[PDB]
PDB file of N, CA and C in Angstrom:
ATOM      1  N   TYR A   1      45.581 -30.584  -0.802  1.00  0.00           N
ATOM      2  CA  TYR A   1      45.692 -30.632  -2.257  1.00  0.00           C
ATOM      3  C   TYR A   1      45.018 -31.862  -2.818  1.00  0.00           C
ATOM      4  N   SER A   2      45.217 -32.984  -2.154  1.00  0.00           N
ATOM      5  CA  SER A   2      44.731 -34.271  -2.650  1.00  0.00           C
ATOM      6  C   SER A   2      45.527 -34.700  -3.864  1.00  0.00           C
ATOM      7  N   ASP A   3      46.109 -35.879  -3.794  1.00  0.00           N
ATOM      8  CA  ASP A   3      47.021 -36.436  -4.800  1.00  0.00           C
ATOM      9  C   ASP A   3      46.808 -36.026  -6.235  1.00  0.00           C
ATOM     10  N   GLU A   4      45.596 -36.101  -6.745  1.00  0.00           N
ATOM     11  CA  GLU A   4      45.321 -35.940  -8.175  1.00  0.00           C
ATOM     12  C   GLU A   4      45.567 -34.533  -8.663  1.00  0.00           C
ATOM     13  N   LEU A   5      45.142 -33.560  -7.878  1.00  0.00           N
ATOM     14  CA  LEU A   5      45.206 -32.159  -8.283  1.00  0.00           C
ATOM     15  C   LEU A   5      46.637 -31.718  -8.486  1.00  0.00           C
ATOM     16  N   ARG A   6      47.537 -32.291  -7.708  1.00  0.00           N
ATOM     17  CA  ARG A   6      48.958 -31.969  -7.805  1.00  0.00           C
ATOM     18  C   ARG A   6      49.540 -32.456  -9.110  1.00  0.00           C
ATOM     19  N   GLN A   7      49.188 -33.674  -9.478  1.00  0.00           N
ATOM     20  CA  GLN A   7      49.653 -34.280 -10.722  1.00  0.00           C
ATOM     21  C   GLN A   7      49.171 -33.501 -11.922  1.00  0.00           C
ATOM     22  N   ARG A   8      48.037 -32.844 -11.774  1.00  0.00           N
ATOM     23  CA  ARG A   8      47.478 -32.000 -12.828  1.00  0.00           C
ATOM     24  C   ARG A   8      48.359 -30.802 -13.084  1.00  0.00           C
ATOM     25  N   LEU A   9      48.849 -30.210 -12.008  1.00  0.00           N
ATOM     26  CA  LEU A   9      49.783 -29.092 -12.095  1.00  0.00           C
ATOM     27  C   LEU A   9      51.071 -29.514 -12.761  1.00  0.00           C
ATOM     28  N   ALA A  10      51.417 -30.778 -12.605  1.00  0.00           N
ATOM     29  CA  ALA A  10      52.607 -31.343 -13.237  1.00  0.00           C
ATOM     30  C   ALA A  10      52.437 -31.441 -14.735  1.00  0.00           C
ATOM     31  N   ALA A  11      51.207 -31.634 -15.170  1.00  0.00           N
ATOM     32  CA  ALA A  11      50.898 -31.791 -16.590  1.00  0.00           C
ATOM     33  C   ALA A  11      51.079 -30.491 -17.337  1.00  0.00           C
ATOM     34  N   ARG A  12      50.880 -29.386 -16.643  1.00  0.00           N
ATOM     35  CA  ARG A  12      51.121 -28.062 -17.212  1.00  0.00           C
ATOM     36  C   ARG A  12      52.606 -27.813 -17.366  1.00  0.00           C
ATOM     37  N   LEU A  13      53.331 -28.031 -16.283  1.00  0.00           N
ATOM     38  CA  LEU A  13      54.789 -27.948 -16.297  1.00  0.00           C
ATOM     39  C   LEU A  13      55.374 -28.728 -17.450  1.00  0.00           C
ATOM     40  N   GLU A  14      54.741 -29.837 -17.782  1.00  0.00           N
ATOM     41  CA  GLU A  14      55.248 -30.754 -18.799  1.00  0.00           C
ATOM     42  C   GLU A  14      55.232 -30.105 -20.163  1.00  0.00           C
ATOM     43  N   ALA A  15      54.155 -29.394 -20.444  1.00  0.00           N
ATOM     44  CA  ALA A  15      53.968 -28.749 -21.741  1.00  0.00           C
ATOM     45  C   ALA A  15      54.997 -27.664 -21.955  1.00  0.00           C
ATOM     46  N   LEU A  16      55.355 -26.990 -20.877  1.00  0.00           N
ATOM     47  CA  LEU A  16      56.255 -25.842 -20.940  1.00  0.00           C
ATOM     48  C   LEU A  16      57.694 -26.265 -21.112  1.00  0.00           C
ATOM     49  N   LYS A  17      58.039 -27.418 -20.571  1.00  0.00           N
ATOM     50  CA  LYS A  17      59.422 -27.891 -20.554  1.00  0.00           C
ATOM     51  C   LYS A  17      59.830 -28.569 -21.842  1.00  0.00           C
ATOM     52  N   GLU A  18      58.885 -28.815 -22.728  1.00  0.00           N
ATOM     53  CA  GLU A  18      59.172 -29.359 -24.055  1.00  0.00           C
ATOM     54  C   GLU A  18      60.366 -28.692 -24.695  1.00  0.00           C
ATOM     55  N   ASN A  19      60.153 -27.534 -25.291  1.00  0.00           N
ATOM     56  CA  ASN A  19      61.239 -26.772 -25.903  1.00  0.00           C
ATOM     57  C   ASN A  19      62.321 -26.469 -24.894  1.00  0.00           C
ATOM     58  N   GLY A  20      62.048 -25.522 -24.016  1.00  0.00           N
ATOM     59  CA  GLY A  20      63.033 -25.061 -23.043  1.00  0.00           C
ATOM     60  C   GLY A  20      62.476 -25.112 -21.641  1.00  0.00           C
TER      61      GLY A  20
END
């Protein structure tokens, strides 16, 4: 995966968890 690419996937999760 390499460190950076994983954190990118986290950034998506972040947007979704805002509301609910």
